[PDB]
Amino acid sequence: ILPDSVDWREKGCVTEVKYQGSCGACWAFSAVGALEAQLKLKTGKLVSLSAQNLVDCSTEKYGNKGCNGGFMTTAFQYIIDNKGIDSDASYPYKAMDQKCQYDSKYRAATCSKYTELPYGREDVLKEAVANKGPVSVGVDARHPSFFLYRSGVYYEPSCTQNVNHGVLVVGYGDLNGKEYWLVKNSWGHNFGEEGYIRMARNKGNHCGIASFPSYPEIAA
Numbered sequence: 001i002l003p004d005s006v007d008w009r010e011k012g013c014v015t016e017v018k019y020q021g022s023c024g025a026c027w028a029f030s031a032v033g034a035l036e037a038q039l040k041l042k043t044g045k046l047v048s049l050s051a052q053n054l055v056d057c058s059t060e061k062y063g064n065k066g067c068n069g070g071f072m073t074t075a076f077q078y079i080i081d082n083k084g085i086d087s088d089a090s091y092p093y094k095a096m097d098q099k100c101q102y103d104s105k106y107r108a109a110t111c112s113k114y115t116e117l118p119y120g121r122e123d124v125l126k127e128a129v130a131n132k133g134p135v136s137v138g139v140d141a142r143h144p145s146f147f148l149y150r151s152g153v154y155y156e157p158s159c160t161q162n163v164n165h166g167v168l169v170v171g172y173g174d175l176n177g178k179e180y181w182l183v184k185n186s187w188g189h190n191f192g193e194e195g196y197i198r199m200a201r202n203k204g205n206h207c208g209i210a211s212f213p214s215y216p217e218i219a220a
């Protein structure tokens with residue numbers, strides 16, 4: 001039986017909210033955030049990982065376009081193929097496309113595999129958030145209400161299941177019975193609920209939140 005509510009921030013597995021600025025690197029922030037939690041679970045260390053490393057290095061070979069968009073799954077595969085990702089401290093974020101500067105002397109994490117959850121299944125997503133960790137997801141964020149969100153459970157009647165914005169599910173719960181997914185965004189600490197948005201849960205795959213979920217793992 002799954003818990004009624006989960007918040008990975010209470011478990012020390014979620015880093016500070018980041019600010020992506022004018023570079024379309026949401027997918028890179030989503031991917032590093034998922035891996036940050038697995039790194040904490042394995043090593044006991046909470047460390048921000050380099051989104052810039054993904055922007056600069058998980059590029060054409062991975063179907064990604066840096067500040068013009070990319071995929072969390074192919075980002076994970078880059079980390080696997082590359083045998084590492086650098087710390088954010090050593091490879092900080094510049095909000096621009098750059099030549100790859102990865103150096104293994106600054107490696108902060110590895111990845112052994114990733115898993116893509118089945119399309120649209122919010123119960124399967126709940127189980128993964130409860131039992132595995134934060135899950136990278138795409139959402140349909142192409143509506144003014146998403147930009148204007150301040151607090152509460154977000155519901156947008158015009159939302160679709162075609163996703164365009166990579167974010168991180170770090171928990172779930174309910175606000176006076178209204179069920180939600182707890183989502184970490186990468187638009188800085190002034191967006192929404194100090195960087196987070198609670199999005200409607202069990203409302204027909206609202207905004208496509210369960211369309212394309214994935215999470216990485218790290219070898220023991």
Ligand SMILES: *[C@@](O)(C(=O)NCc1ccccc1)[C@H](C[C@@H]1CCNC1=O)NC(=O)[C@H](CC1CC1)n1cccc(NC(=O)OC(C)(C)C)c1=O
Nearest residue numbers: 022023024025026027067068069070071138163164165166
């Ligand atoms: C992500 O949502 C993001 O960085 N948003 C903030 C932002 C938006 C615009 C400009 C600067 C910052 C990201 C935004 C994309 C990339 C730049 N412009 C955008 O609209 N979204 C993605 O990277 C997204 C991730 C998938 C899981 C949902 N994504 C990946 C790959 C391709 C596309 N879109 C795309 O190619 O659109 C067309 C119109 C076909 C060019 C995409 O959205």
